[PDB]
Design a binder for this molecule. Structure first.
Ligand SMILES: *[C@@H]1O[C@H](CO)[C@@H](O[C@@H]2O[C@H](CO)[C@@H](O)[C@H](O)[C@H]2NC(C)=O)[C@H](O)[C@H]1NC(C)=O
Ligand SMILES: *[C@@H]1O[C@H](CO)[C@@H](O[C@@H]2O[C@H](CO)[C@@H](O)[C@H](O)[C@H]2NC(C)=O)[C@H](O)[C@H]1NC(C)=O
Ligand SMILES: *[C@@H]1O[C@H](CO)[C@@H](O)[C@H](O)[C@H]1NC(C)=O
Ligand SMILES: *[C@@H]1O[C@H](CO)[C@@H](O)[C@H](O)[C@H]1NC(C)=O
Ligand SMILES: *[C@@H]1O[C@H](CO)[C@@H](O)[C@H](O)[C@H]1NC(C)=O
Ligand SMILES: *[C@@H]1O[C@H](CO)[C@@H](O)[C@H](O)[C@H]1NC(C)=O
Lengths: 134, 43, 29, 221
């Protein structure tokens, strides 16, 4: 709302058909004839409760392609042939780990059983296929 | 000597139905049942 | 497989059923 | 023109390994025994629809790559090749003689604000069937390929190959139109077919390679 002129912001008031999720529409064609955008008040005071709020939404993609935005937790050393609790790139589990001959195709990162439970994981920094045996 | 050339389906149905029953019980672990994941470690 | 299913062995082994089946044959003949 | 004889167009649907397993997936596959368009000529402009199967064969190499866009201008993915690298851009240009043939880049490809690049070594580079699959999704453009060796000149070879992934660039474009780029009386084979959200059953062998597929909706068997 600052008097330096920050109150340029505006919203689409009229639209032909509902906007899809994560879709965008920049058009300003005339909507009997009306401009399709309308600007908020946002003077040093708007109406009460109509102050400008800044917003950001974080969308977490979870595609199971190689992960690229990780939390600050540092890795441990890696144990084989003992049953161990583990967290690989966010895949929490529990089992006995073993460097495994059932080699993935080079693009693949997890293996799954008949059930969705994962039977193998590619270790994200030694790059070996661990068998997980429950 | 003719028994070598000759009902086993009525017995194999036991082996096949127990196999299919267990396999179906395992496959239902992949089912979400409305949850955001089929694997509890995800939740 | 690992998901809590387990198949238990029968009490009578296949060899024990063969022994009984042999005993029924031997007796019969 | 059209051609039909293919059990081709299967690809690995998941980034996850499966072995000695028959698995059922719904994904945008090429329906079995459909009609691919066939051309071997110009740089024609075509619909992308839900996705594309593409393949080529030629003497030496003459496919240079591809153009895509929300419109034939809007952010418009370019993928073109060096001798040793593919190089990739997201910008708008005023695609209007939109070819890379004679009138390592050109075609008024003046980028200003929109490059969002990629560049890498695995692509169509000197090796005969240059199989590709392209699949735009929300935030996604995962591209697939297989350089299947063949003896045929320009008729579509019957047989089975499964395409591996090659890259994904999160372009954010909603692509609607598509075109190829050749280089230059010359001629070379290429084929195009639109993907559909079919259900397939896939036969992963012990190696975890897809050895067979059955297009579930093809026929009653
Ligand atoms: C962003 O970059 C594109 C080019 O990638 C610019 O496109 C030009 O747009 C003007 C109209 O504004 C046209 O007359 C030109 O023909 C376009 N050039 C090309 C090569 O397509 C666009 O103007 C740029 N926008 C901003 C805000 O920088
Ligand atoms: C994965 O596929 C390859 C290729 O078919 C198999 O490798 C062959 O295995 C046999 C038996 O060990 C050898 O005689 C061949 O020489 C191997 N070929 C090559 C090119 O190395 C491999 O066995 C398969 N993996 C599994 C787990 O079955
Ligand atoms: C989809 O395409 C239309 C033009 O065909 C465009 O106006 C719209 O912004 C596009 N959507 C996205 C998310 O880019
Ligand atoms: C980075 O990854 C490599 C494997 O490519 C690994 O050997 C190395 O230890 C990792 N870096 C550090 C600092 O550990
Ligand atoms: C393919 O195209 C031909 C015409 O060239 C048409 O008759 C046919 O129905 C189409 N589909 C199939 C599956 O052949
Ligand atoms: C690859 O192509 C770009 C232009 O598309 C060019 O600038 C670059 O020098 C080429 N790379 C090589 C190794 O020739």
């Amino acid at each position: 709302s600052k008097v330096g002129g920050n109150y340029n912001y505006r919203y689409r008031l009229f639209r032909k058909s509902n906007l899809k999720p994560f879709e965008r529409d920049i058009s300003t064609e005339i909507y009997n004839c009306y401009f399709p955008l309308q600007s908020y008040g946002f003077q040093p005071t708007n109406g009460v409760g109509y102050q400008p709020y800044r917003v950001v939404v974080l969308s977490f993609e979870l595609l199971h392609a190689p992960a690229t935005v990780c939390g600050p937790k540092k890795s441990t050393n890696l144990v084989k042939n003992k049953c161990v609790n583990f967290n690989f790139n966010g895949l929490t589990g529990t089992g006995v780990l073993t460097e495994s001959n059932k080699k993935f195709l080079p693009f693949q990162q997890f293996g799954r059983d008949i059930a969705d439970t994962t039977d193998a994981v590619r270790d994200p920094q030694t790059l070996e296929i661990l068998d997980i045996t429950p | 000597g003719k028994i070598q050339d000759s009902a086993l389906g009525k017995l194999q149905n036991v082996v096949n139905q127990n196999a299919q029953a267990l396999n179906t019980l395992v496959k239902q672990l992949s089912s979400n049942f409305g949850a955001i994941s089929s694997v509890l470690n995800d939740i | 497989k690992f998901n809590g299913l387990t198949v238990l062995p029968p009490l009578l082994t296949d060899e024990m059923i063969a022994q009984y089946t042999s005993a029924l044959l031997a007796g019969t003949i | 023109a059209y051609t039909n004889s293919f059990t081709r167009g299967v690809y690995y649907p998941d980034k996850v390994f499966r072995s000695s397993v028959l698995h059922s997936t719904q994904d945008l596959f090429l329906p079995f025994f459909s009609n691919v368009t066939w051309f071997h000529a110009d740089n024609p402009v075509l619909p992308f629809n839900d996705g594309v199967y593409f393949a080529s064969t030629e003497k030496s190499n003459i496919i240079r790559g591809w153009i895509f866009g929300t419109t034939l201008d809007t952010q418009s993915l370019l993928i073109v090749n060096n001798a040793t690298n593919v190089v990739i851009k997201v910008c708008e240009f005023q695609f209007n003689d939109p070819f890379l043939d004679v009138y390592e880049s050109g075609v008024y490809s003046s980028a200003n604000n929109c490059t969002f690049e990629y560049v890498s070594q695995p692509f169509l580079m000197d090796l005969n069937l240059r199989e590709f699959v392209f699949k735009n999704i929300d935030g996604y453009f995962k591209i697939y390929s297989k350089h299947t060796p063949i003896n045929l000149v320009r008729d579509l070879p019957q047989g089975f190959s499964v395409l591996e992934p090659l890259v994904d660039l999160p372009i954010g474009i909603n692509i609607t139109r598509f075109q190829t780029l050749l280089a230059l009386a010359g001629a070379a084979a290429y084929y195009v077919g639109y993907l559909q959200p079919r259900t397939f059953l896939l036969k992963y062998n012990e190696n975890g390679t897809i050895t067979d597929a059955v297009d579930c909706a093809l026929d009653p068997l």
